[PDB]
From a paper:
The core fusion machinery for synaptic exocytosis comprises three neuronal soluble N-ethylmaleimide-sensitive factor activating protein receptor (SNARE) proteins, syntaxin-1 (Syx1), SNAP-25 (SN25), and synaptobrevin-2 (Syb2). In addition, Syx1 and Syb2 both contain a linker region (LR) connecting their SNARE motifs to their membrane anchors. Recent studies illustrated a Munc18–Munc13 route to SNARE complex assembly that enables the exquisite regulation of synaptic exocytosis. Using combined in vitro and in vivo approaches, we demonstrated that this interaction plays an important function in (I) the transition from the Munc18-1/Syx1 complex to the SNARE complex; (II) Munc13-catalyzed membrane fusion; (III) membrane association; and (IV) docking/priming of exocytosis.
Residues R86/K87 and W89/W90 residues in the LR of Syb2 were found to be essential for MUN domain interaction. To corroborate this interaction, we synthesized a Syb2 peptide (residues 75–93 of Syb2, containing residues R86/K87 and W89/W90, referred to as the LR). The LR/MUN complex was crystallized, and the complex structure was determined at 2.8 Å. The C-terminal segment (residues 87–92) of LR was resolved in the complex structure. Unfortunately, the poor electron density for R86 and K87 impedes the observation of any direct interaction of these two charged residues with the MUN domain. Nevertheless, the backbone of K87 is observed to be positioned near a highly negatively charged patch on subdomain D, which is adjacent to the hydrophobic pocket bound to W89/W90, indicating that both R86 and K87 are very likely to bind at this negatively charged patch under physiological conditions. Unlike the α-helical conformation of the Syb2 LR when bound to SN25 and Syx1, as observed in the crystal structure of the cis-SNARE complex, LR assumes a folded but not α-helical conformation when bound to the MUN domain, raising the question of whether the MUN domain maintains this interaction after SNARE complex formation.
Residue numbers in the entry:
A (entry chain A): 944 to 1038, 1049 to 1480
B (entry chain P): 13 to 18
């Protein structure tokens, strides 16, 4: 009975020894590492003896006792490097009120480095040293778990404190978040305890990233007012041959993507948090791009109207390019899988940008409005001089076809050099928008110049509309043909508006109805 | 000529 207590004494004595294995058996000494191995051997033998002979329900066996001693050493080890962080770091690494500070994060970066040295030491030394129970005792594995867990407890508390006072640059919080992710993924993420993930660490830094985003938006919005002036001062030059937009466009999206790339490198493993960053950054993209549009749409006229006309086209191309490179970001932020409220704001942004390209195109087309009205009054005058010339030599006769050409000649001289210039320097959509707009403008002006309805006059008592003065048969025919020709002129054999669009154009239908009042001479009953 | 050929 005095033997069983003599054994317990010995078992306990070795427990004390191993509970400080690192300090008692330095990795520097190979022979001391051997002694450590001998010490574990002796412990198991004592345990094996007790389990075979005695039947005290078996206290460990061995592996669980050593494990608990190793966990102890780690708790002590963590305490050591926490209290001696500064000295340990500056002595081995490098390039007062020590311990955690609230004015700087330096202490935590140095602590991480020391933590790694410990884990690495337990992997490279000790683990091969203590190889008695490979299935059940991996010192390096258990070193990483304990060291991370002890570090996580302090880091969580530190960031809650930093949340209240802020005081450090957003950069410094951002980098620490990055360095922690590296530590977690390198040593912890593939551990049984943690494998199920949803790790807690990103939540510690969440308010610091949001702040960085808040600062980032105000930085981007600042970079905007600058990319545009640099472009405007350079005179919105087309970049290169097949890129119909200017430099301010590539500058903005490089800035937006660099910023997004920062969030991406965080590799946030908490989707709920990832949705938060995406929801916030989407607001940044919106406010930046909308500002680009709002900046341009507030200056568009001054470049347009009076020649030249290249710049207004490019400004529209730019605005279109915003639309295409947004969608490219939408996929980069993982479209469809993207947070709903985030994709919602971006899809509401594609609409706003679209409804700006339209507004812009309308302003541009209207810059031709006066000259068009002049060309249309000119073509109404020519039409009014259309006569039948029967009893007259066959060479002096002007045909319906020749007459229609003469009617359209003013407006064609106007548009020719233009349409031609566009299409050459507009994206398809930009060109189509301008043509659709110029189309509506020509049809409307024609409806309100050559074919204004008869006026009202007081008839007997109650103001009736007068009878329309019918065009002559030759006049009707010249109108019809000229009209049909403009349509083909805007179709342009498959570069202009589609024939389906022109036909169902409500502006063409109104002009045809207006025309119908005057064209009674040739209109068929029974069509 | 047609403005869309050149």
């Amino acid at each position: 009975e005095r033997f069983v207590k003599l054994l317990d004494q010995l078992h306990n004595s070795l427990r004390i020894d191993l509970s400080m294995y690192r300090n008692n058996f330095p990795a520097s000494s190979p022979e001391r590492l051997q002694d450590l191995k001998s010490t574990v051997d002796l412990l198991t033998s004592i345990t094996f003896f007790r389990m075979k002979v005695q039947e005290l329900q078996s206290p460990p066996r061995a592996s669980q006792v050593v494990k608990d001693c190793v966990k102890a050493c780690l708790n002590s080890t963590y305490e050591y490097i926490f209290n001696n962080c500064h000295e340990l770091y500056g002595r081995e690494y490098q390039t007062e009120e020590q311990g955690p500070s609230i004015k700087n994060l330096d202490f935590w970066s140095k602590l991480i480095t020391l933590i790694v040295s410990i884990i690495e030491e337990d992997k490279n030394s000790y683990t091969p040293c203590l190889n008695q129970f490979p299935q059940e005792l991996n010192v390096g594995k258990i070193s990483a778990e304990v060291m991370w867990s002890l570090f996580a407890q302090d880091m969580k508390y530190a960031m809650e404190e930093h949340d209240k006072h802020r005081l450090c640059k957003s950069a410094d919080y951002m980098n620490l978040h990055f360095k922690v992710k590296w530590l977690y993924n390198e040593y912890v993420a593939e551990l049984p305890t943690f494998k199920d993930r949803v790790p807690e660490y990103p939540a510690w830094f969440e308010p610091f990233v949001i702040q960085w985003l808040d600062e980032n938006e105000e930085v981007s919005r600042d970079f905007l007012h600058g990319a545009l002036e640099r472009d405007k001062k350079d005179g919105f030059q087309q970049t290169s041959e097949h890129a119909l937009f200017s430099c301010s466009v590539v500058d903005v999206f490089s800035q937006l993507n660099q910023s997004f790339e920062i969030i991406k490198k965080l590799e946030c493993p908490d989707p709920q948090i990832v949705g938060h960053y995406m929801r916030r950054f989407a607001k940044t993209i919106s406010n930046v791009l909308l500002q680009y549009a709002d900046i341009v749409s507030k200056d568009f006229a001054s470049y347009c109207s009076k020649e030249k006309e290249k710049v207004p086209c490019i400004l529209m191309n730019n605005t279109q390019q915003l639309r295409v490179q947004l969608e490219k970001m939408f996929e980069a932020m993982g479209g469809k899988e993207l947070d709903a409220e985030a994709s919602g704001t971006l899809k509401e942004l594609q609409v706003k940008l679209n409804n700006v390209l339209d507004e812009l195109s309308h302003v541009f087309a209207t810059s031709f409005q006066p000259h068009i009205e002049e060309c249309v009054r000119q073509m109404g005058d020519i039409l009014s001089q259309v006569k039948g010339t029967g009893n007259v030599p066959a060479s002096a006769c002007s045909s319906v076809a020749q007459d229609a050409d003469n009617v359209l000649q003013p407006i064609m001289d106007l548009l020719d050099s233009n349409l031609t210039l566009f299409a050459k320097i507009c994206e398809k959509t930009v060109l189509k928008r301008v043509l659709k707009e110029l189309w509506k403008l020509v049809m409307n002006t024609m409806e309100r110049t050559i074919v204004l309805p008869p006026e009202f006059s007081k008839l007997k008592d109650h103001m009736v509309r007068e009878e329309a003065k019918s065009l002559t048969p030759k006049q009707c025919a010249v109108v019809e043909l000229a009209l049909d020709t403009i349509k083909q002129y805007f179709h342009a054999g498959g570069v202009g508006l589609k024939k389906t669009f022109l036909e169902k154009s409500p502006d063409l239908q109104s002009l045809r109805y207006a025309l119908s009042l005057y064209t009674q001479a040739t209109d068929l009953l029974i069509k | 000529k047609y403005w869309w050929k050149n």
